[PDB]
Amino acid sequence: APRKFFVGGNWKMNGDKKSLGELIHTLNGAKLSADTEVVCGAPSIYLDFARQKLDAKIGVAAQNCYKVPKGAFTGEISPAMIKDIGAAWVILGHSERRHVFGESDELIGQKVAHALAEGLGVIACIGEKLDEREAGITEKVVFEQTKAIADNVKDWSKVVLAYEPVWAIGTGYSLTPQQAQEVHEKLRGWLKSHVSDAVAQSTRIIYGGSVTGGNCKELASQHDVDGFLVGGASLKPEFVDIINAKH
Amino acid sequence: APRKFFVGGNWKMNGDKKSLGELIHTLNGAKLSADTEVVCGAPSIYLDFARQKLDAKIGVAAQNCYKVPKGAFTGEISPAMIKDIGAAWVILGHSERRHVFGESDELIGQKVAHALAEGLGVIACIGEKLDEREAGITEKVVFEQTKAIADNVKDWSKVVLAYEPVWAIGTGYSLTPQQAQEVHEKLRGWLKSHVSDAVAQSTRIIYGGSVTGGNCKELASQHDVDGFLVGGASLKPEFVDIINAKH
């Protein structure tokens, strides 16, 4: 029953073979609680390298992929490829995809469906913009986004939901345990009414947005927060402390 | 003086380590004219592998990249990383990038400025849609696109221009020698007046769009056609014949 604590580190567009080699080496030797399910999202160009060097017990995620195994889509990679170099995860719908690169709710949905069908795990990301929180429609927005994802999920066994206030990524500012809980509580209440009780109880909803070693203990303490999507801090040694938020 | 024949093979979103390893092993063995400058665009996830396996004498290109070395751009790779695995080329502004992934003239122009500054070569792509060619405005559109590129090029020595009628990609239909020449002649003419005669006389303008082993001899024979950007045929054995289009 109990939802296994889940921490993904999203390196974004960072590192080279040597810098990432050192990051991975530290992580492999770090004292980590076995309690935590760790996944590292590597730049596409280093996915094969990352999977080779990381301990088999730490997962590897592509930071994005497309919705078909092959085709005339210059610049894109597919789940078939991600599988081919031994990774088992993809991050889809990240805020930067949606808002920097105009990836639509409808497209993220198609991508989720294909990724799951090909046997990847999906970290599906949702989140409201600052103007959206200003007008008071956070719930309305993340429900919308979650629905586009959920329409395309037959089986939640290999999905993790990452809630990430867009306005909290990379800025100095995270939500605070209570604010976070209010939205994670809502997303789970949504999976309750729109999917099933068993899915709401077993599906991990994780918070991202300026997570640090200094603020994670308190966030993880919240009942409906099952872990983190970690941006900046995933490049640093304190990623270890965030993996251990609960211990 | 004479502009060296350039043939790039854009594998698009295709292959795995085994299929791409076989394609590569054939190409390394094939009887190819030294005459020709060959570059293969591999999926980002296989760039390192591709460069390792391909003979040094054949170039490798990323099929896309972003416009800063590092940063919060989930899913992107930079010239820095492309360099870091030993590749020296990037394809920018591919039809699929502009019209499937919405990439603007201004962004492409930014990417070109950055890739060149970081010491990659660029295959910069331009091309008109079927509906734009119907309205008689092929000239206007490829000029528009080339200006966005040329505004951002201080040095043309490592740029190659690829003209690729969008509607001709992946369909059964290429332009025919005459229709292609009309455009290449015109694009050179634009470089002549907008940049210089020495840039116009030294810069390679290559054609893409359903180039096969069966039609390439005739296309390459045209005076202002300096090579090919090759899609589907690049996966096949007949890529060799296209590299050999002049002999």
Domain edges within chain B = 1-247
Q: Residue B15 is encoded by which pair of tokens?
A: 């292959």
Backbone angles phi, psi at B60, to 5 degrees: -130, 135
What are the beta bridge partners of residue A39? A8, A59
Residue A230's region, left for phi above 0, alpha for psi from -120 to 50, else beta, is beta
> In angstroms, rounded to a whole number, what is the distance separating the alpha carbons of residues B63 and B47?
9
Residue B187's region, left for phi above 0, alpha for psi from -120 to 50, else beta, is alpha
Nearest chain B residue (CA) to A98: B74
CB B73 within 8 A of CB A99: no
DSSP 8-state code for residue A3:
P
Q: Do B96 and A80 touch (CB under 8 A)?
A: no
- How many CB atoms are closer than 10 A to CB A233? 21
Pick the CATH number of A1-247 from 3.40.50.300, 3.65.10.10, 3.20.20.70, 3.20.20.150: 3.20.20.70
Q: What amino acid occupies position A229?
A: L
Burial per residue of A79-113, b for 16 or more beta-carbon CB atoms within 10 angstroms, e otherwise: bbbbebbebbbbbbbbbbbbeebebebebbbbbbb
Q: Which of B37, B96, B128, B164 is catalytic?
A: B164
Q: Of B184, B178, B174, B152, nearest to B231 (Cα)?
A: B174
Q: Do A70 and B43 touch (CB under 8 A)?
A: no
* Helix, strand, or coil (residue A229): strand
> In angstroms, rounded to a whole number, what is the distance separating the alpha carbons of residues A247 and A226?
14
> In angstroms, rounded to a whole number, what is the distance separating the alpha carbons of residues A93 and B220?
44
What are the beta bridge partners of residue A163? A126, A207
Q: Is A70 on the interface with B (CB under 8 A)?
A: yes
- Of the residues B19, B23, B76, B94, the best mutation for testing chain A's interface (the one with the most A CB atoms within 10 Å of its CB) is B76
- How many CB atoms are closer than 10 A to CB B44? 28
DSSP A10-44: E--B---HHHHHHHHHHHHHS---TTSEEEEEE-G
Q: What amino acid occupies position B165?
A: P
* Helix, strand, or coil (residue B225): coil
CB B48 within 8 A of CB A48: yes
- Of the residues A46, A63, A68, A76, the best mutation for testing chain B's interface (the one with the most B CB atoms within 10 Å of its CB) is A76
Q: Residue B6 is encoded by which pair of tokens?
A: 């350039």
Q: Dihedral of the CA atoms A76, A80, A85, A88 (nearest 10)?
A: 100
Q: How far is A6 from chain B (nearest CA, A)?
A: 19
In A180-199, the residues whose Cβ lies within 8 Å of chain B are none
Sorted by sequence, the CB contacts under 8 Å of residue A219 that are 6+ apart come out as: A174, A175, A177, A180, A207, A211, A225, A228, A245
